Design an enzyme around this catalytic site. Structure first.
Site, PDB file in Angstrom:
ATOM      1  N   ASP A 123      -4.055  -6.578  -7.533  1.00 35.53           N
ATOM      2  CA  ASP A 123      -4.290  -5.932  -6.263  1.00 35.53           C
ATOM      3  C   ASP A 123      -4.840  -4.543  -6.613  1.00 35.53           C
ATOM      4  O   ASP A 123      -4.681  -4.068  -7.744  1.00 35.53           O
ATOM      5  CB  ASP A 123      -2.994  -5.827  -5.470  1.00 35.53           C
ATOM      6  CG  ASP A 123      -3.195  -6.077  -3.989  1.00 35.53           C
ATOM      7  OD1 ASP A 123      -4.335  -5.918  -3.509  1.00 35.53           O
ATOM      8  OD2 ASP A 123      -2.212  -6.429  -3.301  1.00 35.53           O
ATOM      9  N   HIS A 142       0.811  -1.220   0.000  1.00 34.41           N
ATOM     10  CA  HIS A 142       0.000   0.000   0.000  1.00 34.41           C
ATOM     11  C   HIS A 142       0.850   1.280   0.000  1.00 34.41           C
ATOM     12  O   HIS A 142       0.481   2.274  -0.616  1.00 34.41           O
ATOM     13  CB  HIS A 142      -0.891   0.024   1.242  1.00 34.41           C
ATOM     14  CG  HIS A 142      -1.911  -1.069   1.275  1.00 34.41           C
ATOM     15  ND1 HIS A 142      -1.657  -2.307   1.824  1.00 34.41           N
ATOM     16  CD2 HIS A 142      -3.184  -1.113   0.817  1.00 34.41           C
ATOM     17  CE1 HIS A 142      -2.734  -3.065   1.707  1.00 34.41           C
ATOM     18  NE2 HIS A 142      -3.677  -2.365   1.104  1.00 34.41           N
TER      19      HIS A 142
HETATM   20  C1  LIG Z   1      -1.702  -6.724   0.471  1.00 35.52           C
HETATM   21  C2  LIG Z   1      -3.092  -6.304   0.702  1.00 35.52           C
HETATM   22  O1  LIG Z   1      -3.514  -6.238   1.816  1.00 35.52           O
HETATM   23  N1  LIG Z   1      -3.828  -6.016  -0.323  1.00 35.52           N
HETATM   24  C3  LIG Z   1      -5.202  -5.616  -0.153  1.00 35.52           C
HETATM   25  C4  LIG Z   1      -6.106  -6.728  -0.569  1.00 35.52           C
HETATM   26  O2  LIG Z   1      -6.035  -7.580   0.499  1.00 35.52           O
HETATM   27  C5  LIG Z   1      -7.496  -6.191  -0.787  1.00 35.52           C
HETATM   28  O3  LIG Z   1      -8.395  -7.208  -1.054  1.00 35.52           O
HETATM   29  C6  LIG Z   1      -7.454  -5.359  -2.031  1.00 35.52           C
HETATM   30  C7  LIG Z   1      -8.683  -4.511  -2.300  1.00 35.52           C
HETATM   31  O4  LIG Z   1      -9.273  -4.078  -1.131  1.00 35.52           O
HETATM   32  O5  LIG Z   1      -6.289  -4.590  -2.077  1.00 35.52           O
HETATM   33  C8  LIG Z   1      -5.519  -4.363  -0.941  1.00 35.52           C
HETATM   34  O6  LIG Z   1      -6.153  -3.417  -0.131  1.00 35.52           O
END
Ligand SMILES: CC(=O)N[C@@H]1[C@@H](O)[C@H](O)[C@@H](CO)O[C@H]1O
Ligand SMILES: CC(=O)N[C@@H]1[C@@H](O)[C@H](O)[C@@H](CO)O[C@H]1O
Lengths: 514, 516
Positions: free
Chosen positions: B272, B200
């Site tokens: 992602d 993120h």
């Molecule tokens: C590494 C990580 O946590 N990635 C998250 C994933 O889990 C989530 O499903 C997606 C959409 O919300 O993208 C990110 O926020």
């Protein structure tokens, strides 16, 4: 339809006089206060036994819609369903419209009565309309307390103002507005909680004033509302020695009957203020209370501590001649007359204002006009070099703070990064000396023993730290002492604590998705 | 569903897009307006043929309203997703909240058979409640193996620290959910397990060779693929061993070579979220989107600019850098999934107080629990005499704390008054000296730079204060340090932060007039 009164058993009739307390949340395990909020088995059982109504706290609006549906489906006689929504349905249930507190309207009346009246009018109308849409047919409001005591911890900004005529007008306007829909409206708290520093949730307050004054100040809002045709009156737990030297108003025949039902000629529902409250439970046993209160002329016992044994106590009072069956049914008749009003009427979400612009603007207008300032504009800095210091009553009581809320996000664009602390903790906090903004969200409410005194802790800090300015949300009464204690540092103030009140102020001062 | 070729190239492209929205019915309620489409935009994008929505926020009732609303505007039914890892109730309250996956892994150490049966119950209850709300795409289970105790983003979201542990629990969760028609998603390929860097915030660098990847990281993902996981979400990670020039999200070597071909995954390959700093720092929004489809992705999750993505795709088809037949391949796979999802109506399907469900949550928390000594009790005091110090990551991020929650209420009855403070404020707070109980709820999650590390500040407080005990909720990873650094102070630990977890721990340390 409503069944003929005499068709009820004495027990069903007694039960009607009782309003119990649920949570908006659907399930038992979500209940914040299990001691005071019945589970589904106990609730269904009460409703199937003829309970008279339910007061709900908590939950999103979409949920309350679902709760009241469920609750009504268990009832042979349609339930009175009440919630305390003073600031609008949005205050209790997220997803509905929250209005700025009544004292904000108070301001506008001082300056512009004709307009203030009309806003309160649509304040009442919208509150009344959204409530119906959630399945809530009983609005316990307007508060008619005249707040004469800056130090009043319980009433505070919940009040339409410091003078009877101010409160008379703005309160009857609200009633007028709600009267456009079929919901009961409730004047409280008789004969006004206006003058005390003491909170009847915590202990038994005493207002010393005589009958002359009492008719001069406290009463007129109430007179106005009854002539107005307000549906119900909730008394407070108070010692009114000029009327009764023995009993609190809840338990006094001279007050509920002599002063109110008889003198003021109120024909609606006399409603005890919550009967689990410290003020009254301290005075007498739960059973003494229920019977004495009915004796005093109360039509509706609100949240008795022990419901099952209270019905039984009343049944026993009836057999022992301390009360008579006829008395009970006089109360039923009144209950019928109000249940009659509510039966004439909204399906969720339909009826919730939502993004409707006309509503959003009305809320914003009220904040703007009620606002108070010194105009000054403050400094900007680079990232995380400054401090947005947010000071709240309690953190569990601060729903208005949410990630990316205007009060946080906006000062952040300008370099101040947020720190959130409780006012009780602050004094023991050693602050880095850096340019700093302080926003206090502080006001009065139920379960407040005394108000917030940030002035002392603040002055300590203005000496320790480079204050850019101080924003006050909630209670106005500490501004007088702020301007006097620290004239140097500029201040801003609003009645609203909500996101949009935040946005207005913070704007004037000048990446995370989950 | 209509034949695949009935769609215009613009609608085909649009199916590959999933956009973010909030569960709250109204615009002013959105906590994240930048990322969350207002109701007008949402309606426009849907009618343009957008593939699915992902929702965050709202109570469960609120969400059922939302999803009904969204499907009504769609000719091709939408995939509607939320990240409910910890049960639908993690996201939308009123639905069931499970303790985090690691707690299941904890049980699995000593008693695998139960831990697997519990995980299956979590999977089935989650699918069941999701369907109830109108959520047909469950983005879970997380298959990351958390090797790195310092890993900020995954942490307790992982079912455990070993491949065999995750495979078992992860596949159970899947088989549980497989009792209902919903998509299950594996995350985040080829596993975010070992990094200290949250994607993120920044692009994680992964130095592991192919062999190591197949030994630790991959085996969970294969177990889910043979188990039929419908979609596989990929992480933004630089894995040089695999692709020297591109993150996993943008690399055909990784998505097509390793995932689609080598692992033979026939489901939806999902990026992602594309707004994350890890990918955005790497390339412009429009390069990112086309290079993503290039590498073989069937779903573009939350592109930073939606309308500009569709344009950018149509154009690359012109220049022949992408291919039209390549858009309908992905629509084929989207068709296959939507075929499956085609329920029951809220509140029906929601477990609520169902005692089987409530007991499952309670047992997990109870069997996952840790305490320093066999059993120990804490002293009690007169009213408001002592201190209950609640330490949290962020106050806005702590919905498990409400008025009169056990963590507050229970010590309160034993005379410890509540003080709530953020971990970042703590070291600067000079504590009044009264016997004090400390409870910190600290855990890894999305948007975490570094794991919160209380050990140092606690140690300082411990010398200055009559400390009765320390309680940790969330991440287990600092317990060893506690035990070493403060061997004399009793501690308690639980994976869950919710009311029922506070209730359990707090009650165990020993054995309100306020209604509003
Ligand atoms: C590494 C990580 O946590 N990635 C998250 C994933 O889990 C989530 O499903 C997606 C959409 O919300 O993208 C990110 O926020
Ligand atoms: C003085 C005061 O606080 N009055 C409130 C009243 O408005 C409310 O209806 C009821 C509880 O719901 O009793 C008190 O808490």
């Amino acid at each position: 339809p409503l069944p003929p009164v005499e068709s009820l058993s004495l027990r069903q009739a007694i039960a009607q006089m009782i309003v119990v307390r649920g949570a908006g949340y659907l399930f038992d395990y979500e209940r914040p206060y299990p001691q005071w909020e019945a589970d589904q088995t106990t609730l269904q059982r009460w409703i199937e036994a003829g309970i008279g109504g339910v007061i709900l706290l908590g939950g999103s609006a979409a949920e309350v819609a679902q709760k009241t549906k469920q609750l009504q489906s268990w009832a042979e006689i349609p339930l009175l369903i009440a919630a305390d929504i003073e600031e609008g349905v949005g205050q209790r249930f997220r997803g509905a419209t929250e209005f700025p507190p009544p004292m904000a309207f108070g301001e506008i009346w001082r300056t512009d009565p004709h307009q203030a009246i009309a806003l309160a009018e649509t304040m009442g109308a919208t509150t009344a309309q959204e409530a119906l849409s959630l399945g809530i047919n009983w609005v316990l409001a307007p508060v008619l307390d005249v707040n004469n005591n800056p130090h009043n911890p319980v009433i505070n900004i919940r009040a339409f103002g410091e003078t009877p005529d101010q409160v008379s007008a703005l309160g009857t306007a609200f009633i007028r507005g709600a009267q456009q829909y079929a919901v009961l409206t409730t004047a409280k708290h008789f004969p006004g909680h206006g003058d005390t520093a003491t909170d009847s949730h915590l202990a038994l307050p005493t207002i010393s004033h005589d009958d002359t004054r009492l008719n001069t100040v406290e009463l007129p809002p109430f007179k106005a509302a009854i002539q107005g045709g307000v549906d119900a009156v909730m008394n407070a737990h108070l010692m009114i020695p000029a009327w009764d030297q023995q009993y609190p108003a809840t338990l006094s025949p001279a007050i509920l009957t002599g002063q109110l039902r008889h003198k003021l000629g109120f024909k609606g529902l006399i409603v005890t203020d919550a009967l689990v409250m410290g003020g009254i439970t301290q005075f007498a046993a739960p059973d003494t209370v229920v019977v004495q209160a009915i004796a005093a002329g109360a039509d509706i016992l609100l949240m008795p501590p022990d419901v099952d044994g209270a019905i039984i106590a009343i049944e026993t009072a009836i057999k022992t001649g301390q009360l008579s069956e006829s008395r009970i049914y006089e109360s039923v008749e009144r209950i019928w007359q109000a249940k009659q009003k509510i039966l004439t009427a909204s399906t969720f979400p339909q009826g919730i204002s939502g993004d409707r612009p006309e509503t959003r603007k009305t809320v914003a207008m009220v904040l703007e006009r009620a606002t108070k300032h010194q105009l000054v504009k403050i400094s900007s800095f680079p990232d995380n070099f400054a401090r947005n210091l947010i000071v709240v009553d309690s953190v569990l009581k601060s729903p208005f703070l949410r990630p990316n809320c205007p009060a946080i996000a906006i000062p952040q664009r300008h370099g101040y990064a947020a720190e959130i602390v409780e006012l009780k903790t602050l004094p023991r906090l050693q602050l880095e000396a850096i340019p700093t903004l302080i926003q206090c969200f502080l006001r009065g409410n139920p379960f407040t023993e005394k108000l917030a005194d940030p002035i002392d802790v603040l002055q300590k800090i203005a000496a320790q730290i480079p204050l850019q300015g101080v924003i006050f949300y909630g209670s106005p009464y500490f501004l007088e002492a702020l301007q006097t204690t620290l004239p140097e540092i500029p201040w801003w103030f609003s009645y609203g604590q909500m996101a949009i009140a935040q946005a207005e102020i913070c704007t004037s001062l000048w990446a995370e998705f989950i």
